[PDB]
Design a protein around this nucleic acid. Structure first.
Ligand SMILES: [Ca+2]
Lengths: 81, 70
DNA sequence: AAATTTGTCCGTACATTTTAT
DNA sequence: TATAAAATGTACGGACAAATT
């Protein structure tokens, strides 16, 4: 289970949920907790572990894919690039 | 096939508008609601199309302002 | 100040592709 | 070899929030 700082907005520190998810996943990649061509957790698992909607998870992941950090295979999973 | 998902057809048409110079840089494209009406699709589909085009650098958005050709 | 417009977040349903039985 | 289950993709709907007009 990973935590969301969840501070509304206006203070300098707050990020939308999808951005906090992106940061955590990017962090796994950067710290080498996941290696290229290895599968990250499924969308359902990420939903449970982060406590957010499938939409939010897909937004984070989609951003990361368009960044080049990840790639997805329909029906297979999502992997570090 | 010839088939493309709806968000991709929307992307093609907006890109087409920009490529043919029908809208110049820093000019505003139609609103999300006008696009939903014109294409006959959901706000979600429109936002997917636009978001893809923003991420590839063809467009930029301003919350409360509109979406513009880059 | 009100209305408009984009941003975030959530829910459902079904299709498509891969993976497990 | 064939079926089911699992996992991602598309599409849709709603409610509020934030920023501009
Ligand atoms: Ca406005």
């Amino acid at each position: 289970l990973e935590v969301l700082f969840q501070g509304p907005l206006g203070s300098e520190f707050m990020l939308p949920k999808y951005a906090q998810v992106k940061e955590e996943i990017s962090s796994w990649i950067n710290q080498g907790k996941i290696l290229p061509d290895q599968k990250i957790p499924t969308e359902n698992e990420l939903m449970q572990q982060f406590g957010v909607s499938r939409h939010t998870i897909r937004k984070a992941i989609g951003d990361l894919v368009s960044q080049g950090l990840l790639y997805s295979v329909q029906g297979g999973g999502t992997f570090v690039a």
